[PDB]
Amino acid sequence: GSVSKWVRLNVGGTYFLTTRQTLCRDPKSFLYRLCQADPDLDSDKDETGAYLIDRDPTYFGPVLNYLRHGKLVINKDLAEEGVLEEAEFYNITSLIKLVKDKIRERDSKTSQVPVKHVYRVLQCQEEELTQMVSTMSDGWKFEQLVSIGSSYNYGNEDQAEFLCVVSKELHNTPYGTASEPSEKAKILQERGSR
Amino acid sequence: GSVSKWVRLNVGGTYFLTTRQTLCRDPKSFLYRLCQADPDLDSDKDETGAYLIDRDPTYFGPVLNYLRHGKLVINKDLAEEGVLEEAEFYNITSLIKLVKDKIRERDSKTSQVPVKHVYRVLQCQEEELTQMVSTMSDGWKFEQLVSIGSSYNYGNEDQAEFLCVVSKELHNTPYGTASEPSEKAKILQERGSR
Amino acid sequence: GSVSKWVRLNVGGTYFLTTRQTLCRDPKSFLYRLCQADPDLDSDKDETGAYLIDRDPTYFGPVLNYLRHGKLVINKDLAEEGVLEEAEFYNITSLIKLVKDKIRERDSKTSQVPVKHVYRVLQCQEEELTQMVSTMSDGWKFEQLVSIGSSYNYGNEDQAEFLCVVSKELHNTPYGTASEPSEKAKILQERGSR
Amino acid sequence: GSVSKWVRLNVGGTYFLTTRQTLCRDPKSFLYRLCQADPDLDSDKDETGAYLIDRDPTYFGPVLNYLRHGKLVINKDLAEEGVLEEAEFYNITSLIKLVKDKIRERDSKTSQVPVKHVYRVLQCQEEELTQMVSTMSDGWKFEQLVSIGSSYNYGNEDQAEFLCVVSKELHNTPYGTASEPSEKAKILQERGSR
Amino acid sequence: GSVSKWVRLNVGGTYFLTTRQTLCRDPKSFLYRLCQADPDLDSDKDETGAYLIDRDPTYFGPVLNYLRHGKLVINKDLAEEGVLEEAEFYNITSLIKLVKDKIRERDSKTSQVPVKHVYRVLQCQEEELTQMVSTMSDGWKFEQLVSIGSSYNYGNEDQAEFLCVVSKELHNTPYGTASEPSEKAKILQERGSR
Amino acid sequence: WVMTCAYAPSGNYVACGGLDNICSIYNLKTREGNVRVSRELAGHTGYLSCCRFLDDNQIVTSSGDTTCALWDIETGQQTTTFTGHTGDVMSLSLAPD
Amino acid sequence: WVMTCAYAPSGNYVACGGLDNICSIYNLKTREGNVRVSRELAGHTGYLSCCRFLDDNQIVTSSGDTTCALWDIETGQQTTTFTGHTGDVMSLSLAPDTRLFVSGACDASAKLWDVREGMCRQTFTGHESDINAICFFPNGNAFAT
Amino acid sequence: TMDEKYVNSIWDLLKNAIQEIQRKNNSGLSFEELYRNAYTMVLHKHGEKLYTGLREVVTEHLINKVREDVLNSLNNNFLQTLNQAWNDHQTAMVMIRDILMYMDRVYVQQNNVENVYNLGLIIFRDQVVRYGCIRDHLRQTLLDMIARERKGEVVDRGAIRNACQMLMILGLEGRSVYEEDFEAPFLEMSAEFFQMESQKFLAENSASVYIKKVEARINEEIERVMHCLDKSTEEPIVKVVERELISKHMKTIVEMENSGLVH
Amino acid sequence: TMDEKYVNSIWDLLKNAIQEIQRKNNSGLSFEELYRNAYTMVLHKHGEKLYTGLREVVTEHLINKVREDVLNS
Amino acid sequence: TMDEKYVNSIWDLLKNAIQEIQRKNNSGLSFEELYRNAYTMVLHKHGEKLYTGLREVVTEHLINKVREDVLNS
Structure with a gap:
């Protein structure tokens, strides 16, 4: 059992329980393909459930x-x-x-x-x-x-x-955004120099 | 089946058995509302009778x-x-x-x-x-x-x-770096300023 | 719980497998109850059967x-x-x-x-x-x-x-345990204050 | 236990079902060899056949x-x-x-x-x-x-x-100390000494 | 099993497979006690054939x-x-x-x-x-x-x-370190003190 | 090199625009008894040259890059963007209107 | 122990060379407002002795161990390596032509090179002692020694 | 903490610990235990003894188990023993490398001595291949199979492939080991074979038949060398072909025989 | 930080769920789901719009569902 | 200090994985390998050759296999 309304991920071999929609808050994430029930998965297992996510769970x-x-x-x-x-x-x-x-x-x-x-x-x-x-x-x-x-x-x-x-x-x-000053900033700088 | 004196809660991937009393720190807490069954909740882990909510256990x-x-x-x-x-x-x-x-x-x-x-x-x-x-x-x-x-x-x-x-x-x-002000304090601060 | 020479505590949901003898060092500590396999402390888990202690594993x-x-x-x-x-x-x-x-x-x-x-x-x-x-x-x-x-x-x-x-x-x-005054010390402090 | 894509990893005495790629990223690592099958594998046990590792770490x-x-x-x-x-x-x-x-x-x-x-x-x-x-x-x-x-x-x-x-x-x-074989730098330092 | 030349030390729960010989060095080390099978032991399990190591490898x-x-x-x-x-x-x-x-x-x-x-x-x-x-x-x-x-x-x-x-x-x-045994040094220190 | 400081109409906020691309809003008066930054306003494209408090939760900030956009103090996001000049919007006059 | 400070023609940079064997180029203009080091030129064979801004992004660096090589300030890499002296290249002067740098070294011979060619145009000799300082004529057609 | 005895438990005298898992008795060596205290590998200098002991234990485990088990086979199944020995040594050496990467990262390359993994390869090369009897075994074996395949009888190639691949990889960065071992005798027998083959094709075939047969056979031997040997050996046999089939038939080719050249 | 696209889309979904569950339908997403749906917009500084939306939704629903029923009864 | 070995290993893994996914392999293909390769070899300023090589592999797989299938239908 992988998904009925909830998704069990295997993040780097660590099982985590969440729902489709918490991941669907941002529908551009990599987990979008993983969570949704579709045969686009390149890493999953239905012998004991849970898609295979080979990634850091520490920084997840x-x-x-x-x-x-x-x-x-x-x-x-x-x-x-x-x-x-x-x-x-x-x-x-x-x-x-x-x-x-x-x-x-x-x-x-x-x-x-x-x-x-x-x-x-x-x-x-x-x-x-x-x-x-x-x-x-x-x-x-x-x-x-x-x-x-x-x-x-x-x-x-x-x-x-x-x-x-x-x-x-x-x-x-x-x-x-630019720590390098512009031309008029340098103009005012040389004005304020002396 | 899913509720007793104790209750099993799935914060993140892991499941903690904790008393319903301990999970509530004020009756406005969401956790307490999740302790008893509600008609609004649909997605849950009925495999072990533990409610599914989606938060990190590290800050839990x-x-x-x-x-x-x-x-x-x-x-x-x-x-x-x-x-x-x-x-x-x-x-x-x-x-x-x-x-x-x-x-x-x-x-x-x-x-x-x-x-x-x-x-x-x-x-x-x-x-x-x-x-x-x-x-x-x-x-x-x-x-x-x-x-x-x-x-x-x-x-x-x-x-x-x-x-x-x-x-x-x-x-x-x-x-x-920020505290909710009081008006009389500002009144007296102006009084002492001059 | 289950009988074994060791004991498995659910310290904050985390299984501490420690021997019963090392927990007999301080009967004056809550652990020495948890080690009883006889009905002096009975605790189980609907997933493993581990005894339940509502103490953190952070400072355990x-x-x-x-x-x-x-x-x-x-x-x-x-x-x-x-x-x-x-x-x-x-x-x-x-x-x-x-x-x-x-x-x-x-x-x-x-x-x-x-x-x-x-x-x-x-x-x-x-x-x-x-x-x-x-x-x-x-x-x-x-x-x-x-x-x-x-x-x-x-x-x-x-x-x-x-x-x-x-x-x-x-x-x-x-x-x-510290900074505990004394009467004659205060007498001399009053003498020397002036 | 190589019976499917998931294999058994022994940490803390517990047996974890990890995919091959979570153990395999390069031939230098130790987790790689456990996904390779040979008759010299002496990490077999009489419980379930899980493969034993020293890992119970703090900085891995x-x-x-x-x-x-x-x-x-x-x-x-x-x-x-x-x-x-x-x-x-x-x-x-x-x-x-x-x-x-x-x-x-x-x-x-x-x-x-x-x-x-x-x-x-x-x-x-x-x-x-x-x-x-x-x-x-x-x-x-x-x-x-x-x-x-x-x-x-x-x-x-x-x-x-x-x-x-x-x-x-x-x-x-x-x-x-700091040294360079240039004699004239030493001449200049001595000249500037007085 | 742990009754043969090989044993499975449960160090932090983790099964470390090791020869009895590498652990039998002298009785100064704690481990020599655990590998050497003797009566009056209460640190051993016969349900899996392992000699427990109560010390988790965190300051072992x-x-x-x-x-x-x-x-x-x-x-x-x-x-x-x-x-x-x-x-x-x-x-x-x-x-x-x-x-x-x-x-x-x-x-x-x-x-x-x-x-x-x-x-x-x-x-x-x-x-x-x-x-x-x-x-x-x-x-x-x-x-x-x-x-x-x-x-x-x-x-x-x-x-x-x-x-x-x-x-x-x-x-x-x-x-x-402090204090010198040379009495002449003490003489000179006292002489230069006044 | 702080170019401008404008005293708020309420006389309890102050605004700073320097060579940096951040507009500083200091809440001068609070129960803390001392000045602490009410709001840093980030995201300015050019350098701030003149600023004037249109309110105490929003402010006109003539930054560089022809920008003198209105800025929401609370959110830190410019609400109404004023563009059309050439070079930095350097002056900023507030009407009694 | 810094013996060479050169002011850039623009003034946005200053160069200093001492016994650190590193030419320090300090940017004097920052939107932060603080003088931060523009570029550290590391890799000279010896100690810097006299450096000059022929450019705001390039600099000639008369250094110790018989080198007065030119460096591109931007990349921190050598631009025009200069070799040929016997004593270390310790003095230097740029012509108002900005095309002829004559470097006074401890070989007691003023080698006037070409700025970006890697070639020494001539070697004025006549001093039996090391050349302390060189100042070009206000045209670059001559220089005292 | 760094100094004076603390003997009898852990750290130091690892020859036994290493050679336990070199006999593939694996549960992990000690890696989790040494993970935490690793700001003392180079700042308190346990690395000299560790490097010396690692080289020594690798050498001793080569002589004690690898070499005599290599020698017991003359040229039959010697290929299998060499392959198994190389596989076992590499398996041991790869988990070896992980333990000591910090000192290998600083001190070993500070001392201008070869990389720890490269050191293990060097020691295996010295202890197995570079010793005389094994080296002649390899030379004679590769020569015999290559000559037999050139003669027209089918032989197995996977074994000669893995042996030659060892010869390249054991040669460090270059093919120095392979060149010293088999490349030169291969070139010699190839020159002999090309000469006798061209002569027999000239004798047994007419002019056009000789041309066709010799070109087809040159193609066949190039195909075999890509198939029975590696890629880097094609240029040497190409120059041998040039010097044995054309450069020795520059001026004996003007008139040929039977159908000739002018004919 | 203000941007209105996803806020209005999720408020569409939220008012749809409000109508569903106030019609005594067992559907209407999970309580945590709707809670987070509101939460993302209230943290996003548009709670006044949601206040008005709830006002008008409850207004029209009550008027057209139970007010006329009370008038009928 | 050298870079070429794991750079060519990164190219090997990237091209093998891209070929496998373009040949629609439904197994393996660790994302960790892909992103480790990508970051590790863009860091040393080989992002340009990533851009070019990825463009090249995509282009060639467009030409060789699928374009002909477009033509022959």
Whole structure:
């Protein structure tokens, strides 16, 4: 018994139970041919049931999660590259893009070594620094406050009295839409250079 | 035939025998509705009397862990987000709460990659300095100490002499990067802003 | 259930085939009931006949290894807190102490995750500064130096020369066993507070 | 038991019905020979005739997926070390080029065990920080920023007012020295020494 | 069957087919007990002809052992407790000390748990600064730079003008050794102490 | 290189358009007591040059590539697309109308 | 220990060569806004000594071990390998013609080559000591030494 | 952990473990057990002893079982023994390779020594083929069947095919082993056969009949060499044909006999 | 993220099933099936359209099935 | 570091499988082999020769077998 209304898949030798329609959420997937009752199968068995799917069941998880509820799952043990491979096996373009973004976010921190960390410098006095640090922005880490030597307006109680440099790591995908700037962007860049 | 004091449930490919009581964490949960037979359900595994529903057992893992044990601990290698997706499909507000708390804990644990990190500023005098660094609160990490000029009492030993700056990985928000606002809080924030 | 020298537990739907003798180590644990083939614990499965335990196999691992060969091995990819909870479920006090020691080692190693972290400030001038920086203890990490205004000359060779804030990643002990005050200690604390 | 296309695999003592191709992708693997029939097969038993394997593993999974798709597997808790240890052993021929990077990347991590950071001093006038701070180079991280006075006007609004100090890791493999047989480079180094 | 020269050890349930001879090496190993058929056994099954191995191969592998085919050794990510207990199972106090030293090496080269760090104060004036900052010793890491109050050249460029506090993380000794038997060294240490 | 910042009509959101192709929407006021990004708006073709809050859930964003399309803040998807210029739509005037 | 920094004619790139044996080309223009390294030219026989932007995507790299080979910046591959000196090629100068690069080496002989031909047009001799720096005439018809 | 004895259980002294499954007593060797601790193959240097012991155990299992069982057959069923020995060695060697791919990936090619699988092939070649009696057995056997097939009697080809295919594959990348063993004696007997055959066709046939018969037979022998031997041997026999049937009939061909050439 | 093609197709199917099961027909897909059918569109930010569709479907069905029956009775 | 061996093995498997499916084989033909081959040899920048070779095999199977069956009917 392979299908009556439900389908038992054999993903890489691992039996899984689902229904035709959960796979039919996206009717362009590779499992479409497998699940539907048709003699187009190039791998199946009716001696004990279940079509033969010779593919990763380990990386079938997040792909089936997207196939069921349109959401990618990024586990800590999950090779985002591997789930990208499985998604491209099961042709989910938006999942492909999202997993590519996940891969590049992970690489910009881990495999490409921590790079392009954003650093900013903020002028603050005491009355400003207290709540600025208190109201420190989301996803940003304090790095160093320094007290600038001052002679004008004493060396204290001056709007320009402290410099706080902060940072935010970019576990960020480099832009694939074009991380290379255009001509007018470079025009404005040279204008702002000096 | 298919229902008893215990019930066999086919989450994914595998079949778990669990009491009908344990499967429900709130009577709005879909699992409880699946515990008793409904005229709407058509596709099921009548081969062993176990209802067929289509979700990953890996994110059912922490869900059933909380349901059986009453406390939710999501593994450091598994997506707490997958647990949240499982809960939201199964419509368990309690699990929504715990996944929320676990995600806050993880954001504290992942407060190195961009997610809010609390930072605070304290005043101290030269004398008080040793005390308040020594008596600095557990769960907080000292980040910086800055000497300043003394506007009172010579150049040293001033009630405003050193600014300590500490931090906490856990974010100050009620949840993650976004919490449901309240209007009176904004009213008072505007009141104190001016 | 079925009678055998071993026993097959349905730990979270997962068959643990372990000998009955290794489960007789702690009658004070739920397992020693599950090993009874006589009607002291009767449990079966309508597919295999395995006994049923509604405890997770997630943290059952290290506890079962502690039962088998006398020593716990918490895998460093699973929450030691979950192992402590599993130890609590079987309420093995030695196992509780061992997992709490593991969590203490974690917190000492993860003092920057918000747990115990000790801090101090030394006072020295340059001459002794080099000495005690060089003779800094193993475990105590230098975190910041700072100068303090010197009434002698303008700088060096004044007793008030340099504060030296140093730190150490200290273990956080799970509560209920640590940080328990005493009456005469509080008397002396009140005496020294002023 | 070769009685049909599905054959018996012994893992955990359980017998799994796996198709030939889930065991067969190349002649180098061990699962291949169990799909080939010869009278020297001594893996036969007296229960059902299933073929016995040592496998009861913890790291065979993602690297079997690697065999099945040919992309090295790095997890957020199992980095290029995991490739370098398991993906080598499962005998994927394409890894030899890939693992080299995994080898260098691994070296690039282990080379920083004797911490090798390129340290740079950049003098800046105060008005000149935020630019070159905001335009910090990739892989270059800000580390320190120390004020300094000057002979004229106490230092502020002068080029000798701040010293930024930045550091960059090495992706280099571990070294003990760097040498090239060019004598004139040594001449130039000695000339620039004074 | 397991009553003949061949046996089927149920290691983690998995049937490992092995000669009694390869398992009968000496009684120091646990396995010698199981393969050798003797009265008073309760670790054996006569329903299938197998001697059970209660230890699943999940820390049967990292056991420090010799004289067959396998692998061992604590890695930089392998648990300390498992290797420690597996060494203690192989007796010798020298073995215990050496395995502890190996764990301290793998934890102290990065200085985590042994937490072994070295700190130095380099007295450099301004012009020299970028020199030893740029020409720092590899295997080290800069930590702080602090100016010094000066009485010559407007407080800038003194013979002592900056303390560069540098550090490095590594074991002074991977064994964690201390105390020297040379009394002349002690005499000299006391002489240089005052 | 952030070109534009526009203060929302409600005075509690702020918008940022820089050389990046993402429009930043910071919810300045929340019960959190500090600024956190309400919405990152991705999918801009050209670089943002000027932007103006048409609402607090949608905004006009004159990006590059002749695009000054209306953008839904919540969904992050442009709803009405404004094309027809040459080069980047660089200026953006909001009427009291 | 960097002894050569060359500014590109466009200014979008800068080249530096030290004892790393690697010619670093840094892109000064990014939509990210951060100065990221354009290209790492690895494969020189010795240490770089003097490099010049005859192109924004090509660069002449007078390096150690008697080489002043030309590199295509885009591919990171050698464009016009130059060999023939006895001492390492340490100085270099581009003519305003942008067609004659004369390289001062430790062979005490200024070899004026052809930029993209792989051939040394001539070998001006007369210095008994290594040529420190070469500056062309404002026409490329001559150069001091 | 890396140093000092931990003897009597697992790891080290694997000659016995290897030769257990080389006798096809298979349940798996230890692969699951060594999967996890593999960041110590090259960083703690157990690879030198492992490589040396692997070479030694392969050599010893070649001499102890493979060689003397190869030698017991002179030229009949010697083909079957060689094929079975090669099959068994390859079966053992392929599961051998999986255990030690990391050290073979780094240290072996760092030491400029041949690949572990290629090392096993080299050791089999040294221990079976390159030893004198077996080598002469192969040479004489291939020569005898090729000559007998050339003489007009039908013989089996699958055996000579698998033996020759060994000779190529055991020759590493080239046909060095085959060239040293059979290619040259094959060329010699082929030259002799072409010469005597052309002479007998000239003697027993007239001019046109000699031409037709010799062309048909050249085609037949080329067909046999594709059918009884491999592809790479066709060019040598082609040049032998050129030097034995045309280059030795350049100037004895102008007038032939009976129907001649001018006729 | 808004796109209306599959949302309207699945709402066609959902209203068809609504009419079937509100006609007391045992068919009408599985409860999990219809639940997911609605779920994909409600997560897709078009729940207002579904609200109106349910409103009008229930409206006309009740008017033409039971309102006139109550009038008849 | 070399690439040619598994590249030609990939071509072998791809062409054998394409021929089998074009000859409508109803057994075997692991998808894992197909996609492993495809990714592993497009990664090293042989996607162009995949494009050309797949075009070629499709073209030739169009010409040799099915076109004549079109003509002879």
